[PDB]
Structures are given as structure tokens and as C-alpha cells.
Design brief:
Elements lengths: L1 H14 L7 E8 L5 E5 L5 E2 L4 H14 L8 E2 L21 E2 H10 L3 H11 L2 H10 L25 E2 L1 H13 L5 H12 L8 H4 L5 E8 L5 E8 L6 E8 L5 H17 L3
The protein binds zinc ion.
Keywords: Antibiotic resistance, Disulfide bond, Hydrolase, Plasmid, Signal, Transposable element
Family: Belongs to the class-A beta-lactamase family.
EC number: 3.5.2.6
């Protein structure tokens, strides 16, 4: 209960002053078994924001496994493709970027143009959704491209997941035979190399722990993170935290997620 008491306090704190739909969602799964250890609002919808980028790179790796795509395949793209927050892609207009490099940028740096270019490779948000459905996630859906997918219109289901659907999908991507081991290894390595989630779970993580994660931020207070983490330098659980609707500032939203993290670490067992 203690971490769930903390998630509820977090929600109470982030949503008291919201005067619009506002919630926090949380699940913790055992990575090996898939067992749900604890959850809060497990089947309610939250905007994915940049956490979709892990799923996207999943779809891409699936195509690589099927010999329909190559990690080394180079994409030269246009300035017209560049959208807000493109820290890596805007540096490679001349030389282009490989698929591998685009996934690295989309995951480790949350580069939006990298994500859109990867979406184009698979046929767009509806095709990502078709991929998800095909691997047993009949909940998660991507509908728009970057940046519009972050609109977070209260109770709009476009571009959303559920905590339990995301957690299970992440588990299947990282540990299933859905992907080849080579592909699963690369996916988790991109997540481990995440450079832009410092103020969330990583801020509560003891040294020596493993964490592979992907954060997201969007409109209307939306913020979240998906992670595989564990003590002694290997992952053993999946954690998914989302929130939407809060009017509190970024730093308070980050702090609340970090505190949920500090609690689940404290009560890890
Ligand atoms: Zn379906």
C-alpha cells in the first residue's frame, strides 16, 4: 500500500487545483513473470507523449527482424520535415541519419523529427497501432504525428495508452520472442542511454541500479515515464507512471513522479 498511498497523494496534490479531468496512473510489473505487483488506475487512458517512441522503434525492429528494414539504412530528409524539439536531426541535414541513429535520437534524446521519420518508414501512426494490435495490445493507439499527438485534450482517446497495456507491451518488447534477441537488446540499450529523463525516476535511483526508460511531456499537464529497472545492474520490474490534466508546473510534476519513484525503490522488497 505505501507506494499506492504515495501515488494517490501525488494525484491529490497535482489535481486539487485542476478544475478539469486530472489523474495519475501507475503500474509495477514483475519483468520475468508479467505479474502485476501493484497498480493505480491501471485501465484508464493517458496520453503517451514521447513514451510512444519506444513502441515505434519496436515496430521498426520488427521490420528489421523480418528483413524489411535495415539498422544501417540511411534516410536523407528535408528541412521541411523538421519539427519542434529536434536536437539531433537538425544537425544531420547534410549527411542524413541511419535507422539506428534515428531510433537512438527518438529514444535517448526524444527527437521529434526522428520519430516522424521512423513513422514514415512504417506507414504512419495507424500502422504503429496495427503493429500493436497484432502483438496483443488492443488498447494503445497512435493517431497523430509529432507534435500534435501531445494535445492531451481532456478525455480524448487519440494517442493514448493505459498503464497496464503499456507495461505489458513494454514487457513483451523487452523480453518476449516478439522481437529477436538482437532487437530486444538494442531496444533496451536505447532506453538505458536515455539522456532526457533525469528529473524523474533516475533522480530517485540508487547507484548501481539498472534503468532503461523513456519519458514524455505534453500539453495540459501531461507527463509520464515507462521504465525497466532493478538493483545490482539488471532490470527486474517494469514501472509505468502517467499523469494528465494538472495545472501544476513542470518542476512540481517532475518532483511528484520522482517521489513515486523514491517510494517504489524504498518499498521494493
Ligand atoms: Zn485489436
Amino acid at each position: 500500500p505505501e507506494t499506492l498511498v504515495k501515488v494517490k497523494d501525488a494525484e491529490d496534490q497535482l489535481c486539487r487545483t485542476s478544475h478539469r479531468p486530472c489523474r495519475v496512473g501507475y503500474i509495477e510489473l514483475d519483468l520475468n513473470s508479467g505479474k502485476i505487483l501493484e497498480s493505480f488506475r491501471p485501465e484508464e487512458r493517458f496520453p503517451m507523449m514521447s513514451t510512444f517512441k519506444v513502441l515505434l522503434c519496436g515496430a521498426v525492429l520488427s521490420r528489421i527482424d523480418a528483413g524489411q528494414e535495415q539498422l544501417g539504412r540511411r534516410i536523407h530528409y528535408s528541412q521541411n520535415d523538421l519539427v519542434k524539439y529536434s536536437p539531433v536531426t537538425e544537425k544531420h541535414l547534410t549527411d542524413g541519419m541511419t535507422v539506428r541513429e534515428l531510433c537512438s535520437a527518438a529514444i535517448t534524446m526524444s527527437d521529434n523529427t526522428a520519430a516522424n521519420l521512423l513513422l514514415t518508414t512504417i506507414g504512419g501512426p495507424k500502422e504503429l497501432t496495427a503493429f500493436l494490435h497484432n502483438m496483443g495490445d488492443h488498447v494503445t493507439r497512435l493517431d497523430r504525428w509529432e507534435p500534435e499527438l501531445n494535445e492531451a485534450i481532456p478525455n480524448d482517446e487519440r494517442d493514448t495508452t493505459m498503464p497496464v497495456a503499456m507495461a505489458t507491451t513494454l514487457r513483451k518488447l523487452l523480453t518476449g520472442e516478439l522481437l529477436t534477441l538482437a532487437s530486444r537488446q538494442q531496444l533496451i540499450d536505447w532506453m538505458e542511454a536515455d539522456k532526457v529523463a533525469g528529473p524523474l525516476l533516475r533522480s530517485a535511483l540508487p547507484a548501481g541500479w539498472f534503468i532503461a526508460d523513456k519519458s514524455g511531456a505534453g500539453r495540459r499537464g501531461s507527463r509520464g515515464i515507462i521504465a525497466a529497472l532493478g538493483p545490482d545492474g539488471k532490470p527486474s520490474r517494469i514501472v509505468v507512471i502517467y499523469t494528465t490534466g494538472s495545472r501544476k508546473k513542470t518542476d512540481e510534476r517532475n518532483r511528484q513522479i520522482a517521489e513515486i519513484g523514491a517510494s517504489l525503490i524504498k518499498h521494493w522488497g
